[PDB]
Amino acid sequence: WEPFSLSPIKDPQALHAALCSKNVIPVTSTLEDLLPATQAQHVFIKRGTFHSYNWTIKGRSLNMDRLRETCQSLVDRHSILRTSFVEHEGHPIQLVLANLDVKVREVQCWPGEDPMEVCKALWDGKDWPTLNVLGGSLPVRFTLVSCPGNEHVVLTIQISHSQWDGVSIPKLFSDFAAIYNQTPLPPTSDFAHYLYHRVSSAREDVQQDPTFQFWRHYLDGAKMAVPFAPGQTLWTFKGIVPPTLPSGITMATLVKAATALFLSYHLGSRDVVFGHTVNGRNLPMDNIESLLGCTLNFVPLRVTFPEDSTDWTVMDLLHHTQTQYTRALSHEHVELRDIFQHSTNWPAETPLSLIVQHQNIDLSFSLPLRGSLDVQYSKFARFDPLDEVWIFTEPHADRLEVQVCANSRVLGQEQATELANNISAIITKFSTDPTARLLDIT
Amino acid sequence: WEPFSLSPIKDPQALHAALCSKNVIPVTSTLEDLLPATQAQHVFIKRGTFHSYNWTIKGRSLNMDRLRETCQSLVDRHSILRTSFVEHEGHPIQLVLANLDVKVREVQCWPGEDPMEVCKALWDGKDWPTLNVLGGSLPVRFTLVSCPGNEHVVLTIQISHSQWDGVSIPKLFSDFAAIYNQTPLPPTSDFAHYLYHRVSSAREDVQQDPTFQFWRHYLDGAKMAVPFAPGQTLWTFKGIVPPTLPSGITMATLVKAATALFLSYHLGSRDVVFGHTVNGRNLPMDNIESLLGCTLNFVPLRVTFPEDSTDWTVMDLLHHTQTQYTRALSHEHVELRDIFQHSTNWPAETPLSLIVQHQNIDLSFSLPLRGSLDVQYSKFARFDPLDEVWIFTEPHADRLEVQVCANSRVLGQEQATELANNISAIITKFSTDPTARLLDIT
Amino acid sequence: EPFSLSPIKDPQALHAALCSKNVIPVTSTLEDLLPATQAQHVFIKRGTFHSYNWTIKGRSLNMDRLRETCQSLVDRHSILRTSFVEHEGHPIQLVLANLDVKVREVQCWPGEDPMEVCKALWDGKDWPTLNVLGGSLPVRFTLVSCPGNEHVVLTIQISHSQWDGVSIPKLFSDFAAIYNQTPLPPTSDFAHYLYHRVSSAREDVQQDPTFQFWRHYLDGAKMAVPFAPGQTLWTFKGIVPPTLPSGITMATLVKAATALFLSYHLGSRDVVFGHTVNGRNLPMDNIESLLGCTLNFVPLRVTFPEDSTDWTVMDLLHHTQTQYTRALSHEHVELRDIFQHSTNWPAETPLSLIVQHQNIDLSFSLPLRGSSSLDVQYSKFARFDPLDEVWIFTEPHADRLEVQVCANSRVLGQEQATELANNISAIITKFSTDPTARLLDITF
Amino acid sequence: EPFSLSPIKDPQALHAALCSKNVIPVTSTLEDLLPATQAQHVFIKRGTFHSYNWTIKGRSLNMDRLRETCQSLVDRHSILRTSFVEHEGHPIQLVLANLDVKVREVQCWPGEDPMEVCKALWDGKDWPTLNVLGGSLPVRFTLVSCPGNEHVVLTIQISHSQWDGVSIPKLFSDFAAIYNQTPLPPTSDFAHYLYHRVSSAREDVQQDPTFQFWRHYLDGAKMAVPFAPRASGQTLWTFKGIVPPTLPSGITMATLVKAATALFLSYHLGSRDVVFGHTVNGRNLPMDNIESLLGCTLNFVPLRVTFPEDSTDWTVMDLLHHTQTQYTRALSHEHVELRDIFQHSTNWPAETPLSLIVQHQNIDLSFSLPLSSLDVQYSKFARFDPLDEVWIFTEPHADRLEVQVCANSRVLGQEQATELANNISAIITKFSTDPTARLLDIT
Ligand SMILES: CCCCCCCCOCCOCCOCCOCCO
Ligand SMILES: CCCCCCCCOCCOCCOCCOCCO
Ligand SMILES: CCCCCCCCOCCOCCOCCOCCO
Ligand SMILES: CCCCCCCCOCCOCCOCCOCCO
Numbered sequence A, B: 001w002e003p004f005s006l007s008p009i010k011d012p013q014a015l016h017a018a019l020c021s022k023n024v025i026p027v028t029s030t031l032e033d034l035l036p037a038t039q040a041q042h043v044f045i046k047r048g049t050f051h052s053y054n055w056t057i058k059g060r061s062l063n064m065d066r067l068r069e070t071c072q073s074l075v076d077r078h079s080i081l082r083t084s085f086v087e088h089e090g091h092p093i094q095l096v097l098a099n100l101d102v103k104v105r106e107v108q109c110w111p112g113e114d115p116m117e118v119c120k121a122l123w124d125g126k127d128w129p130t131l132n133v134l135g136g137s138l139p140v141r142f143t144l145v146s147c148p149g150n151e152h153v154v155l156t157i158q159i160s161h162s163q164w165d166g167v168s169i170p171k172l173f174s175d176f177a178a179i180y181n182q183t184p185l186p187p188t189s190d191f192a193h194y195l196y197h198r199v200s201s202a203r204e205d206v207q208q209d210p211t212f213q214f215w216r217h218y219l220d221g222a223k224m225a226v227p228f229a230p231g232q233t234l235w236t237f238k239g240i241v242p243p244t245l246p247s248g249i250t251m252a253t254l255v256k257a258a259t260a261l262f263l264s265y266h267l268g269s270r271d272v273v274f275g276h277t278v279n280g281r282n283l284p285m286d287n288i289e290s291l292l293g294c295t296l297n298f299v300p301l302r303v304t305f306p307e308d309s310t311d312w313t314v315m316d317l318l319h320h321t322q323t324q325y326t327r328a329l330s331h332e333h334v335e336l337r338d339i340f341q342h343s344t345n346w347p348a349e350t351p352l353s354l355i356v357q358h359q360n361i362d363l364s365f366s367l368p369l370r371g372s373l374d375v376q377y378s379k380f381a382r383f384d385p386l387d388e389v390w391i392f393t394e395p396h397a398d399r400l401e402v403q404v405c406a407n408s409r410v411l412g413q414e415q416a417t418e419l420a421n422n423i424s425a426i427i428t429k430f431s432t433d434p435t436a437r438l439l440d441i442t
Numbered sequence C: 001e002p003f004s005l006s007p008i009k010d011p012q013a014l015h016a017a018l019c020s021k022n023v024i025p026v027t028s029t030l031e032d033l034l035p036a037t038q039a040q041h042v043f044i045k046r047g048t049f050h051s052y053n054w055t056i057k058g059r060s061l062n063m064d065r066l067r068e069t070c071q072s073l074v075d076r077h078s079i080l081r082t083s084f085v086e087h088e089g090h091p092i093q094l095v096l097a098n099l100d101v102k103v104r105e106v107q108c109w110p111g112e113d114p115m116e117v118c119k120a121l122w123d124g125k126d127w128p129t130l131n132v133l134g135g136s137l138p139v140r141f142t143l144v145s146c147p148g149n150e151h152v153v154l155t156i157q158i159s160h161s162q163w164d165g166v167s168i169p170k171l172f173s174d175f176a177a178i179y180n181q182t183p184l185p186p187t188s189d190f191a192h193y194l195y196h197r198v199s200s201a202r203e204d205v206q207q208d209p210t211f212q213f214w215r216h217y218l219d220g221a222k223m224a225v226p227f228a229p230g231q232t233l234w235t236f237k238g239i240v241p242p243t244l245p246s247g248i249t250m251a252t253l254v255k256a257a258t259a260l261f262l263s264y265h266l267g268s269r270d271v272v273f274g275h276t277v278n279g280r281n282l283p284m285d286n287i288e289s290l291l292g293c294t295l296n297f298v299p300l301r302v303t304f305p306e307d308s309t310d311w312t313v314m315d316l317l318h319h320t321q322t323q324y325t326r327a328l329s330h331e332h333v334e335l336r337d338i339f340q341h342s343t344n345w346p347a348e349t350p351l352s353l354i355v356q357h358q359n360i361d362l363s364f365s366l367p368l369r370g371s372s373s374l375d376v377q378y379s380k381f382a383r384f385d386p387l388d389e390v391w392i393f394t395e396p397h398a399d400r401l402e403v404q405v406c407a408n409s410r411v412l413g414q415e416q417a418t419e420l421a422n423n424i425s426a427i428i429t430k431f432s433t434d435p436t437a438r439l440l441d442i443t444f
Numbered sequence D: 001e002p003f004s005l006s007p008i009k010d011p012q013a014l015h016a017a018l019c020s021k022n023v024i025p026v027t028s029t030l031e032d033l034l035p036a037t038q039a040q041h042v043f044i045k046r047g048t049f050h051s052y053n054w055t056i057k058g059r060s061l062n063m064d065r066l067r068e069t070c071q072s073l074v075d076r077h078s079i080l081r082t083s084f085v086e087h088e089g090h091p092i093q094l095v096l097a098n099l100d101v102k103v104r105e106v107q108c109w110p111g112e113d114p115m116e117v118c119k120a121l122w123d124g125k126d127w128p129t130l131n132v133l134g135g136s137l138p139v140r141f142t143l144v145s146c147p148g149n150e151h152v153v154l155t156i157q158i159s160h161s162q163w164d165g166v167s168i169p170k171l172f173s174d175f176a177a178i179y180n181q182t183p184l185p186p187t188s189d190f191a192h193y194l195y196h197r198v199s200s201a202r203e204d205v206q207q208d209p210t211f212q213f214w215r216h217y218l219d220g221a222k223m224a225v226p227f228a229p230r231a232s233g234q235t236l237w238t239f240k241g242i243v244p245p246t247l248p249s250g251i252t253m254a255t256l257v258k259a260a261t262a263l264f265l266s267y268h269l270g271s272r273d274v275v276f277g278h279t280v281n282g283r284n285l286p287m288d289n290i291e292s293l294l295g296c297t298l299n300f301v302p303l304r305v306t307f308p309e310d311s312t313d314w315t316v317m318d319l320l321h322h323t324q325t326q327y328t329r330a331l332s333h334e335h336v337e338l339r340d341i342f343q344h345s346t347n348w349p350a351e352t353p354l355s356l357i358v359q360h361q362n363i364d365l366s367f368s369l370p371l372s373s374l375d376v377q378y379s380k381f382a383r384f385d386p387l388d389e390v391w392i393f394t395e396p397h398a399d400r401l402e403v404q405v406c407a408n409s410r411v412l413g414q415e416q417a418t419e420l421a422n423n424i425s426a427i428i429t430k431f432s433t434d435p436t437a438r439l440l441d442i443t
Helices: A012-021 A039-046 A064-077 A115-127 A169-180 A191-200 A210-219 A251-266 A314-326 A336-343 A413-432 B015-021 B039-046 B064-077 B115-127 B169-180 B191-200 B210-218 B251-267 B314-326 B336-343 B413-432 C012-019 C038-045 C063-076 C114-126 C168-179 C190-199 C209-217 C250-266 C313-325 C335-342 C414-433 D012-019 D038-045 D063-076 D114-126 D168-180 D190-199 D209-217 D253-268 D316-328 D338-345 D414-433
Strands: A030-036 A050-058 A083-088 A091-098 A105-108 A141-146 A152-160 A233-240 A271-278 A297-304 A354-358 A374-382 A389-395 A400-407 B030-036 B050-058 B083-088 B091-098 B105-108 B141-146 B152-160 B233-240 B271-278 B297-304 B354-358 B374-382 B389-395 B400-407 C029-035 C049-057 C082-085 C092-097 C104-107 C140-145 C151-159 C232-239 C270-277 C296-303 C353-357 C375-383 C390-396 C401-408 D029-035 D049-057 D082-087 D090-097 D104-107 D140-145 D151-159 D235-242 D273-280 D299-306 D356-360 D375-383 D390-396 D401-408
Touching: A012 A030, A012 A083, A012 A091, A030 A191, A039 A091, A039 A297, A039 A336, A050 A115, A064 A141, A064 A152, A064 A169, A105 A115, A115 A141, A115 A152, A115 A374, A115 D114, A210 A297, A210 A336, A233 A413, A251 A271, A251 A297, A251 A314, A251 A354, A251 A389, A251 A413, A297 A314, A297 A336, A314 A413, A389 A413, A400 A413, B015 B083, B015 B091, B030 B191, B039 B091, B039 B297, B039 B336, B050 B115, B064 B141, B064 B152, B064 B169, B115 B141, B115 B152, B115 B374, B115 C114, B210 B336, B233 B413, B251 B271, B251 B297, B251 B314, B251 B354, B251 B389, B251 B413, B297 B314, B297 B336, B314 B413, B389 B413, B400 B413, C012 C029, C012 C082, C012 C092, C029 C190, C038 C296, C049 C114, C063 C140, C063 C151, C063 C168, C114 C140, C114 C151, C114 C375, C209 C335, C232 C414, C250 C270, C250 C296, C250 C313, C250 C353, C250 C390, C250 C414, C296 C313, C296 C335, C390 C414, C401 C414, D012 D029, D012 D082, D012 D090, D029 D190, D038 D090, D038 D299, D049 D114, D063 D140, D063 D168, D114 D140, D114 D151, D114 D375, D209 D338, D235 D414, D253 D273, D253 D299, D253 D316, D253 D356, D253 D390, D253 D414, D299 D316, D299 D338, D316 D414, D390 D414, D401 D414
Parallel strands: A105 A141, A271 A354, A354 A389, B105 B141, B271 B354, B354 B389, C104 C140, C270 C353, C353 C390, D104 D140, D273 D356, D356 D390
Antiparallel strands: A030 A091, A050 A152, A050 A374, A083 A091, A105 D104, A141 A152, A233 A400, A271 A297, A389 A400, B030 B091, B050 B152, B050 B374, B083 B091, B105 C104, B141 B152, B233 B400, B271 B297, B389 B400, C029 C092, C049 C151, C049 C375, C082 C092, C140 C151, C232 C401, C270 C296, C390 C401, D029 D090, D049 D151, D049 D375, D082 D090, D140 D151, D235 D401, D273 D299, D390 D401
16 A cells, blocks of 8 residues: 555656656656556546536636636545556556646637537547547546636536546535535545555465455356457437336346346357446445545356246346346456456456446436536537447436447447347336246247 | 148149139149148248259250250159249149140350350349249249350250259259160159158157157257348358368268357357258158259257366367267258247247258269260359358368358358358368367367 | 552451451451441440341241341341441441341240340340440341240341431331332442542542532631530430421521520530531432431531621521531531641541431331231330530420430539420420510520 | 618617627627628628637737737727628628627647647637628637747637738738837728729719720620539639749739630630639729728629630730730729629629639738747638639749639539649640740640
8 A cells, every 4th residue: 555566667757757758747746656557447548438527607606716726626635636547568557646736728708609619619629539548648627618707607527437437426526516615525535545455455376365266156167158250339229117126126137137138048048148337336445435436347247047947037037137246246346357367267358248337326417516506517428339339227217228339330220229129128028027937028 | 642632722723723824834734733832942932042054065966856855854754843833822832733845945146156145144134133933933944045056055954942952953964964865764753752751751749759859859958049130142252171080070060060169159158059951861762862852951950068177179079069960860851940839949930040051962063965065064043041141161172162151231241251261260170180179269 | 449448458358357256257258348437436436236126926927038038138238238347546347248147046935025035135245245346247137036936026236337317217118128028129338328428529628619618617616615524314305396487497496596505605606516417418329218327417607696686586597507508518528527628626626515306217117017917016225325425316206396415424414414405495495486586585 | 971871771770689689799889881792792602711820939928918909900990890791681781889809718728739729619610600691790809828828829710701812911910010009000991992982983874984884895795604513512622833924024924814714715615705703902993091991892803805816816915915904994993893794784684693703812922910029920720612603713922823723513523623723724834935926826
């Protein structure tokens, strides 16, 4: 937990010096740590995942210098916000900077000119097209666009998905609002400190790590299906009515199960492995629930159907699926390539090809600044998958939304559209008779 | 075994008389039998499988009136060549005609004009674009195209793949040559007789039926993978050095096992079902081996891998594959939709989605007409698969040739090309160390 | 005469060279050897190629006689025995003799339509491999029969370098006559036409009344030139058959409409453009009934006077007709000769707009007769692919005058071609309706 | 004087309507209201829109003074405070007064480029949403800065209906002068120009010498008319440089260009009497400061070139002299509306458009805005989308004469445009190399 002792590079201060030299980061900045970048961070960075969270603030009481100051303080409190991402010596790494001055990009618009249209212009015109996270310049930056009277302002926060996740992003907002409202905040832990905790929980002799033994056992016997080799990102949507969840059964479990029966039909298998997304926050850590970073992980989820004389109800799969999740809670946090390297005979660089992600997170957002201020949320976002298929479930109050995201070369529009409906129809089926033997709908 | 004993319609001699008035068949023809069209026959008809077998004849000794006579003689001999195909009362059926006068289409070319070029023009111009087998006009027809001296003549025989297969097509040529050479031929059984023999061979009760008992146990607890969502017929080729065959092993086994390993990686299955072509000539009747028609069958082939605690050599697989074939010999001749209806849960109209066909048949062809004459073979062919992928293998002297044929929407050129290279690669690996245990591919 | 117009020293050793490559029959003789006209090379360069098809249904039909008719008709029309070649880039006619005609014959399956067979041969090989300047004989016969020979198709293939509108019906009346052994008059070779054209030429050109006419005719004229420009397009617009003012011909009315279209677009009061003439005003004998391509494509100059002169449609009309009638005696000479002898223009200057009024037979016959009675219907297959030029064809049927524009899509796009056809249509009809109007027409 | 020429009964209720829609500032006055000229309306229908970009790199820069220079300049030039609209069918200028200029300002991130930002705004919203006839003031300023104000890009946006080649350098020199607080000799409106044109015109139109000159000038003429051509289509620019032409004694570079075209046209049209469009500066009116006032006084008028019959044996020199006087003859008459030329002096439809316009760029091709020491570099962004017409522009740089062709790809395909540029180019060179040649000449 002593700084610079997880660096894969030995003169870390000299990599700092060079970025400064190159005017890639501020030259008055200090290097307060240097750690490996995680697999899940790289997943995002490699997919150009980049957000611009925008807050349209209207009202007479807005304090502009305080807005500016809040940005600085937000960054002082969250070291993930002070982090540069770089590859050095074949190592993907993150650099924690301190003594970091935040400078807001400001725009005083012409009369009648819409603040948001200006942001959308900066965004489309240079902000994401020239995005180069691995060049080492901070992804996290602020923009202030104000009509002339300052009674209609848009504040934006740009950030790489390597720096937040669904559980902690709301904490970024409430922190910001609290800092602007002058509400004292409790001290917090860094994403770096999560990394060090991951590492302290590991044995130096891998064959003695309960985690990598659990995975070796969880996965012994198993074979993961591999798509036959495969140009734009495609998002495809299907809404259903929110399905009834028998006691003990998580909505996530439903989706993970409905996918497994889909994959059992289409593969010739009763032993399917596919990727799903875990929050990575089931560690014995202080602040684990609140710290800001990307502790999300993408891990193997094995669903196993019985020989077949066994007359499984839907419910039998439901409980089994859940167990194939909950079994791994204390082991869900390791690097995916580690699991492959230590618990399997699979190439460690083996990619997941399908990734199921249920969104049991906040689906609406809030930034309650005080005077009276109307504050409205919107975002811009990029996300470009490689060869994998993402299935996203969003549990709203009116609907579950099945979302498929994949490159068109991996899954064409009609394939995407069918996969949506197939997964939905099964979720529904599981909901309409959890009792039925698995002899359904296809 | 009486005629019409297998007709699924009740007035056969009136469907006949209907066709004659629509001028679909010769009015002076007689209807001798009427039977169900085989499932595999329909496979080809549905795919517009149509050949023009072309014989280029050069020499001074040619008897034109004898060539014409021989065409007629050949049709009197083989009833499948006297068969019209129609659909009626929801039923796919085949009408056997007699008192059928064979009329040749004849072309007297201009000096300098190439008869083959004329053939090609009629082929691409009308013959195959207007092809409508199920309308009920005879698929089998002859064309004679002559340079003015009758010393360069192309003879042409058209035919649906529903009326021949790989083993019996040479019989058609050899008989043709015998007839023209006035060489006496022995009595031959008809394709119909083949069908009457399948019925006699079966019991009226189905679980009772040992063939459907053997499949039920062959396919018990088996799951056959189903491709995701369903352009142009694309043919794709890769030829390798003819692999060496360990003692006991057929080339067909080497290919079938290479496909199973391939599908076991991609499906993450130890239990793979896929389609494959059998000659369907293991029934014991007289002339089974020599009768003209399509007795090809497409049937499930199941390959089962053990846990790798067993540690299979390649050889263990080869032997298992071969055995998963040889087991079904006495049962391989039944309708596929019957196998599904009677031995499985599976929907009976379940399509094979992959079909592996090893061409252990004649690959070169001869028509030794006598005077001296030069007689050269060539062909025109149509074939348009549906949603399935065919893998064909041709064991020539200088190369094993792997050939993939599928619609481009089912499998795109880049993929097809990879499939070809991959299967070839596994075949080749199987050949250079049959003893190796399962690793390394591909 | 023969061979006096041969642009090669050894004709017989070009014929032998061809016989030796199996381009023409080995038993054939070379009987004349002349230049192909400029008009002939126009059609050849555009791959202009026709299959004239006769559907014959009936009991009394004599296949053997049909075959002989083919041979004899070719016998009497030397253009039908002509093969085309280039030798020093300047295409020539080899007239053949001792020419055995061999019909291509098809006996169809029962049920097989004979026309579909012909059509398949046409698209499958006959035109796609056409190579007239290779030397093989363009004129060739096909006979496709249903098995009882009571329904046949006869097809005559031919290059447009071997026929024109006025003489094609002769080919049909001759065929029918030969078959019925009805007696026929004697007739002239197309080659006779060529010889006659030259006979009337002056041995030196600045003296030739023809090239003197053309010099005066085009004196002052500038012919407009398209700016730089891949499929042949045909575009049609039918209008009510126009009323013709007294003395004014239909063709004149079409050509005046165009002239006016052009003067407006060019902002010119003196337009020159191409138009087709029949080339059969030469006073030779049997001029109007021989068989070949006597067509010529020549300049038509239309000069509008200043606006103070106050011209009526009628004035434009008479002048237009006059600008045609004036050239009758001189319209038969090579265009490239008109240019180099009578003007300042490059000899190889192409005509870029060609107006052709079809004042010829538009429907045809083959009264084969038969010993019960033969029913013979006409139809045809045709290729024609313009180069950089635009054609305007008018077609005067009973119920419509069909304005036809043909031109490569790269030259005149579909929507322009539609506008051209419509505009020319409108001007015409507008002329018909009020011939006394002043040239203050609305139109565009 | 003000509100003369106003083609609407109630001008101030049109300024009212605009203000109560926040199209223009509520606190602004309607100082004048006039017709928009035909040439102005040409540029507007074609979306002609410029951003003039000054990159200032230096120590001494005064940001507050920059803002104010913006204000003063707009005060000085009434065309800069003009808004454009279409009422009663026809497009008109509203001149505004008591108009406060609001500069758009951007303080960039560290290491973020000012110009990349302007560019982003330009393509992101500035031109794609342009709507001049909607009434918003097309003239508007932008200042984008690096965080120490030692690096700034000022931009000026403007419609081509507000400037032309002779007066744009004035805009720049006036700005610098204001910035530097160098005093300035007063100037006239663009509005002054309009009021003058009406003053010098006669009221019985058949009595106006201008329209008698044009009637006589175009007497007997027919202008050729394009055929169609249609197919959307893209604006193409095509360039061909040639060696700067040696000029024959007494002949200008512009005559050289227009004679080449005439010769090109007479050949393709097969015509000895050709009429085509060409651009005049419109600054020959005798008026105070005609040469300095800021606006678009440009006009597009007929140039008629008449070749005699061959027996006359014209030389290239004859064509050059004739062509030049076909221009100098019209100098005093060049300032009237094209549509008025056609209505009053010909029998051609008044709304007849020119289909070919030649414009010789005998104006400044480089620019300046000179303010420790400030380094001030020029660049620009620009839109322009022609309709059915073809433009030919010639640009007389030191190393090359640039023949530029502009026309929608539907009117002239890339291939034709390239050939046009090469043909005209080649004719110019030929004329230059052998001006005594007879017009019966080779390539
Ligand atoms: C056979 C149709 C499958 C459609 C392709 C879906 C595109 C991406 O899917 C990724 C999931 O991959 C796991 C499934 O593996 C299938 C392997 O198929 C090989 C049989 O040829
Ligand atoms: C994968 C390329 C498509 C090849 C054509 C079909 C080949 C027939 O093999 C069937 C086995 O394929 C399994 C289907 O895979 C579906 C699972 O993935 C679909 C969505 O993730
Ligand atoms: C840069 C403008 C080009 C100059 C005008 C050229 C117009 C050519 O004169 C037309 C005479 O040509 C008649 C035949 O052209 C048919 C092509 O039509 C295509 C477009 O008009
Ligand atoms: C010549 C191709 C179009 C070039 C762009 C338009 C140039 C405008 O110049 C107009 C002068 O051309 C008028 C002549 O147009 C020819 C009309 O007749 C051709 C037959 O359609």
